[PDB]
Amino acid sequence: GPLDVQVTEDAVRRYLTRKPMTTKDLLKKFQTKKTGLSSEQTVNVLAQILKRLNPERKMINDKMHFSLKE
């Protein structure tokens, strides 16, 4: 299937638009086993993305979740 799992702002935005997610929830969507990225590279690019998006922060189950869900 031309044109897989890559850490992009587009992907993060789509996940956060669907539902609030913690940092751990998001990291689970971009597993190193699929990207081949080291844990450090993964944390670094996700940080840049989350910084730019600056998602709303909601407390759910006593835990801060990022959210672009209105």
Partner: peptide, 18 residues
């Protein structure tokens, strides 16, 4: 877990780390 470590590292990174 490793996910837990990465999450702390990400959250700490958001505090303007590396």
């Amino acid at each position: 877990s490793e996910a837990d470590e990465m999450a702390k590292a990400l959250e700490a990174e958001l505090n303007d780390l590396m």
